[PDB]
Write a protein that binds this ligand. Structure first.
Ligand SMILES: COc1ccc(S(C)(=O)=O)cc1NC(=O)N1CCC[C@H](C(N)=O)C1
Ligand SMILES: [Zn+2]
Length: 139
């Protein structure tokens, strides 16, 4: 679990969005596993606007932060789950690191701010949904 809070927006994994997120929907994209909902309270997370390929992510299944080197956002094949059929997920960045399904939502950050959130994983792999291209999150 986990979300990004910026301006009057809440960014979460689409597969973990609540009834309240859908009732206050701003934008969603199944191909990216992202959903954005509106908030009444102001948020203070900063979104990175950069091309960093290194950062630190929060891993809730270990209660720890780990440094990672990750690939540039791309279309990556993701096996079927209870949430989606087998498909290419877009804007996904992979790295070597520990992740379990419940780790989705953990923030990936570089020195410029929030890069994305955990969205996929594998055996010794962790995948992050990029949010740096969503320029409208800042206006
Ligand atoms: C952090 O997630 C995992 C971590 C580890 C593994 S495993 C035990 O196969 O190594 C599997 C996963 N599960 C995972 O990638 N997804 C399930 C939830 C929806 C995700 C999506 N964006 O399509 C896909
Ligand atoms: Zn950066």
């Amino acid at each position: 679990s986990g979300a990004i809070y910026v301006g009057n927006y809440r960014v979460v994994n689409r597969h973990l969005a609540t009834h309240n997120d859908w009732a206050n929907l701003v934008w969603e994209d199944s191909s990216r596993d992202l959903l954005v909902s509106s908030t009444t309270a102001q948020g203070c997370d900063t979104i990175a606007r950069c091309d960093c390929q290194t950062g630190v992510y929060y891993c809730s299944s270990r209660r720890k932060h780990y440094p990672v080197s990750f690939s540039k956002p791309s279309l990556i094949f993701v096996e079927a789950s209870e949430y989606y059929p087998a498909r290419y997920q877009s804007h996904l960045m992979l790295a070597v690191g520990h992740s379990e399904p419940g780790d989705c939502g953990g923030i990936l950050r570089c020195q410029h701010g929030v890069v994305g959130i955990v969205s996929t994983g594998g055996n010794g792999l962790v995948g992050f949904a990029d949010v740096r291209d969503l320029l409208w999150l800042d206006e």
